[PDB]
Design a protein around this ligand. Sequence first.
Ligand SMILES: [Mg+2]
Ligand SMILES: [Mg+2]
Ligand SMILES: [Mg+2]
Ligand SMILES: [Mg+2]
Lengths: 387, 387, 387, 387
Amino acid sequence: MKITDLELHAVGIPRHTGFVNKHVIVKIHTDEGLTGIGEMSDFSHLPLYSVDLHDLKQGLLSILLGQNPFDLMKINKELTDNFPETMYYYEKGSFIRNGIDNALHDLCAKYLDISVSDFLGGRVKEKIKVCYPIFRHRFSEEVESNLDVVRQKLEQGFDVFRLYVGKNLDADEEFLSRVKEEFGSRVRIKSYDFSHLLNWKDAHRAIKRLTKYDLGLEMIESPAPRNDFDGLYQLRLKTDYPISEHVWSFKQQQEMIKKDAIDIFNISPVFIGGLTSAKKAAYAAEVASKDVVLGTTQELSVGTAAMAHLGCSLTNINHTSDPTGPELYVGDVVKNRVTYKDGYLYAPDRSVKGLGIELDESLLAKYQVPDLSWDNVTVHQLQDRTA
Amino acid sequence: MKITDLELHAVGIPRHTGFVNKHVIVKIHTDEGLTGIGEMSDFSHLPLYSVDLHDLKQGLLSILLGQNPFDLMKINKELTDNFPETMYYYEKGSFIRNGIDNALHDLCAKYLDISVSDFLGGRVKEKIKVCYPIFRHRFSEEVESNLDVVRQKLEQGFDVFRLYVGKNLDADEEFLSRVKEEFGSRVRIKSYDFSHLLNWKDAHRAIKRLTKYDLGLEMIESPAPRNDFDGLYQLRLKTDYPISEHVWSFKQQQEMIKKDAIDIFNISPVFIGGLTSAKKAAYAAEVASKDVVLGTTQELSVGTAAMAHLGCSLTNINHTSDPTGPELYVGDVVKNRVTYKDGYLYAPDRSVKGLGIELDESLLAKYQVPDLSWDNVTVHQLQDRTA
Amino acid sequence: MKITDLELHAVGIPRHTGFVNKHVIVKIHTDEGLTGIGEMSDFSHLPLYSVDLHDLKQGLLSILLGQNPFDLMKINKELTDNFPETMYYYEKGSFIRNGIDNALHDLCAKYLDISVSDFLGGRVKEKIKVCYPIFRHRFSEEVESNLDVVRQKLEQGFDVFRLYVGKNLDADEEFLSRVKEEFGSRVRIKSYDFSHLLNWKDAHRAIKRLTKYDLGLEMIESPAPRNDFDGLYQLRLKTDYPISEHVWSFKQQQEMIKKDAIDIFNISPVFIGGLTSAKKAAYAAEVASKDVVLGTTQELSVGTAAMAHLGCSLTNINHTSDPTGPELYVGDVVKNRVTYKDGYLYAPDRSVKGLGIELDESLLAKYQVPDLSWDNVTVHQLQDRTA
Amino acid sequence: MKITDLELHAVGIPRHTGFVNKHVIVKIHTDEGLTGIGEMSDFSHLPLYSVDLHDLKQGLLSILLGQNPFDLMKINKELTDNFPETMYYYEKGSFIRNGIDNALHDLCAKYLDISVSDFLGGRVKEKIKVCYPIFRHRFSEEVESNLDVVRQKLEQGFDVFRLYVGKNLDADEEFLSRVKEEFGSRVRIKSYDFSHLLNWKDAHRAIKRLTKYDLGLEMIESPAPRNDFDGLYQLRLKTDYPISEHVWSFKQQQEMIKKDAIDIFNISPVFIGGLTSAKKAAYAAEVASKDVVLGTTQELSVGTAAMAHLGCSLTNINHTSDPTGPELYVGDVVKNRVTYKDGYLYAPDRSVKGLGIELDESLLAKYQVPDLSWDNVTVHQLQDRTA
Ligand SMILES: [Mg+2]
Ligand SMILES: [Mg+2]
Ligand SMILES: [Mg+2]
Ligand SMILES: [Mg+2]
């Protein structure tokens, strides 16, 4: 069983918020005819440069050609050798490794005629509670619209949300106040996400005022600058609420564990390099007796399926998670999108071998884009995912 | 696919050193007729009490009956719930979990018609370098015999050994001196193992005198009391050689990582609860950028096969390992023992589904023992594995 | 005075060692006709992906178009906003910012009819002592050739070299032994560079054996993994020799200062984002009373000129530096290359406004490459800069 | 281009508060006829001794004569060699270096026919928000007068003030209460300045009671004894408000950064040695991701212009600053004083080469004083700047 070819399909898919993200769908072919599909999710994050896909295909083929897809450890070592961890939340090399590794999981599972779920340790649960995102308000006039989003998504079954804050505390607080007023306890905002925008003391001030509104609050996320382990730790001591932070590299995670800097490790395949790398991070957290939440960059159904399988295999996810990409994007590239019901993300049919998802060639063509080039966008928009 | 029954076969097998160990061979039956075999290796360690196997079978069946063998994470969680980690090197509950988990790996692999190697992440290598053990000298008159062991094993292909030290430094040093004198550089003693017998300062003194003899020395193992993380750390700073310590619980490992107490994590399925638990520990070490060595309690071919598969899947084993059980025991319970050549342990045939090993019912009967009861033995003998 | 257009010229230039690097020459045009030239030096480092230059030109123009070139702080803030620091030695975004910022310095200086030297604080010295690199030996058979390099470069005036070590200590030591034997004290090897390849304890062992050879040794560089501040600190306490490390981000530098992890800060424009960013790093080091050495990625004459101007303005460079790009590359893109005499890099003519260098359009065409795509190369080769 | 002569003009100028400060206006002449003007601001601080200006002129000429004004780094090194940093807030040697360095900036800019703004990195903003000072109350009967100051300055456009506290908490609190009562939210008191008068615990008590009044409070300044880094740190952990402290030497700043002792670094040219030294301090703060506020000793228009140029070039000034000297002093020595509008200090006309200020010889004569001798004044008056 050996890899014979690789295909990278670039697509552009807008969100209901108006933000347009570019993704890359992966296809890994073998000598036996089995093909694994994967996803290099959301390249639309800073830095403001783009990766040449023609060159990337050559580099990746050079690595994969002739290899046994079952050699996951070997292949991931070589992938990391060529795309080193950088201690940066949005390293494009991590998105790349992720697409290859989840495609390999799909491939191996298909070959074995089993769901990726059973290739990852089986299931602990059949679905995971998630939350719908409300992007940060930079202005008070943005509140009304966001309240309608809550009203609409709640009616659709999403009773839990998360709020990005930090830019305009008055606006943040106006929103939280309106929500509590209109929905009482019907809606929960499980997290206030600062996106590394504030130094910890300022975050402390913000946290102190925002936490006046506790609508089923579960955690405060990224309340310090990237890699500010000391700040995270001090904040963890001053905050009653659990502190959560994204895991973007093993070194970064090791340090947060060494310093006991946080309470919840936000782990997501795309930011750490794939399912293989995410499992290592999740197991490290388990060994450290740390809580885990399944994070997201907001991916399409292929990427969401992959993470749903991993999510349902973990024993230390005791809080609400974040992947709601297929609900946020207006389009997708599959025949049947992953399913969300009552604010829960369901793991794909365990009876279906592979990821449990199927590409729709007509949709791949429909959303096709010539490259990962950038369009007109501001830094604020890239940070907040707004348009 | 569900578990329907469980069998526990107790056996007693003497070593060439004269020490007799008791093991338990596991059989996990399913509704579809597939059976997974496992091993609860070497129960012959302190504390000086024994586990009732009739009661254990009931407790384990209560847990396993009706479950899907592929739910490894779920099952291991329940196993740990019933057999908690204790921070003790020889917790019998860990040996128990190990036997069940490796039997489940065998079962799942058989069902999928693949080697356990491909169920663990494939291969990074086809064999792992190991060393033959020379148990500690309590007296100078024990040296001669041990020199013959070296002479004999070297001729058989084992050019690397490890030496247990600490009880009699004069004897330890006499041995090392004789070896260097007779074999020059033909033989390497990759580790001096103190077995947690000395406080770190005394170990430092011992290390300073013993390291006068460096025959390809790779590490100093367990040079401090059990769980003495501060001592290990101080010794790590005073020793040029890497310091290695066994991983017997996640809490213990977390602490050694938090304090950067050691250089090499000695990981072995039997002491941590199985392949699933060992993978978690190995991945935690990888995330922490720490070296790993495959340790051992000296198991039979079933247990050695399981660890050989895991060993060949890891990317961070850069030193000589220790599993040489099948070479140390006079008998075994399989049709074909694992293979050792030129001081290397080979991973079972990757073409053979499952563990790649086969039980020999006649040998199971031959070595059968009614229970895990203890025979006449001293504390020194249990610590040194001598007779 | 405003920016009106931008040009990015990709080139490929082989080294005498056989390694081929790709660079990007920058041109920033203004309404008044003045053009600043710059260099995005050596993109040929991992990660193994390449930046789309057509897209990059658009992104950069979006930032620069219409701006006043004299607004260096404002522009650098916006550059960093779009190309965030990642805590990674070879972040391509840093090379990009560097090319833009040094082109802006050239532009501003030209407008003022002064040398970049006088735009950076004048001069403290007219030349800086540098060393010629001897890339790491992976095999003993590579020694002879490297000895000839020393023999040849010494005859040309380079009496100081630096040696990359870590892969094969026997080979490293063979080289050092041969050199001392053949040249006595005629040649100095000012640094042993581990390139973050070893954990600090292994580096300590290596340092202990390699430092048996002290041929005017000034420092040990990168003797620990990237961002291993604790390791650097411990090594700094165990090593008599100064410990030096590259500055690749302000956060990383802040942490090495907070922990007093090193003795010498290796600062180079390309890895930190340009002259503006390098000045900030150098001043931070000065405020911290820390020694500085001018590092390098080995750039062409445009990039080397820029760093020569900065180098000669600093008051805390008390050791031998590393930029010898124009001596290492077989070709260049200027009419007159920077000058090296007696192992010293001379700052460009202070009477010549701007960088003091002039592009040669025929050479730009000669070395032109269609893009920054990768050719066949191994990880070892990318780490060691060998072919 | 070389320095040929130096002039030091001592002047005495009273404040509207009645306090009389002595300053020294600097003139640096060159062979080409260009003259740079500078200011050694407010020598009227303890210690109670004065510097002989005849001797100083000789010492400074010895240093400057024949030098190239563009050699800022070289000259500042030599200035610091002769006037060492002492870790004291009011080291007269710092005022001296400051006057020379800002005069050199004026000189270099004039030669280049550009504003000092463009010699410092351009602009990030065109004006900086400042606050008017209310000096500490030692008695309750001093409150009324200070309330009139607020009433009067507010009408003139200053809506932000800062209050010196610590001597009489009852008086401090009486003032704050009256202000809030009479102006509601019309006026903001951005800082409560303890002037290093109290030990941190006493400051904590004072802070706890004073912060009952939050009129746009931005920071607590100098809430611990000089150089009490541990105290500043403990207070930073116990105070929600940012803690700010003056930077009077690089060693002091390095230590506050090493210990993460404060939130905001109050940087001002006069206390650190000039624009060159202040830029180094500001860049160090930037590298440390620390906020900066432009502090003051309250200087004349020459010194305020210099700092206005630096202030508008920094990217990390996110709070209200303090320089309001030209509004506080009854007289000045220039043709046109720096401009303040709506509580903002405007950077001098960017079209005017040099500092953008012009000396008025008649005013220099008017305010001339024979030396820097002290008049009758008490320690309390020198600490509080009262009369
Ligand atoms: Mg995203
Ligand atoms: Mg044992
Ligand atoms: Mg380079
Ligand atoms: Mg003053």
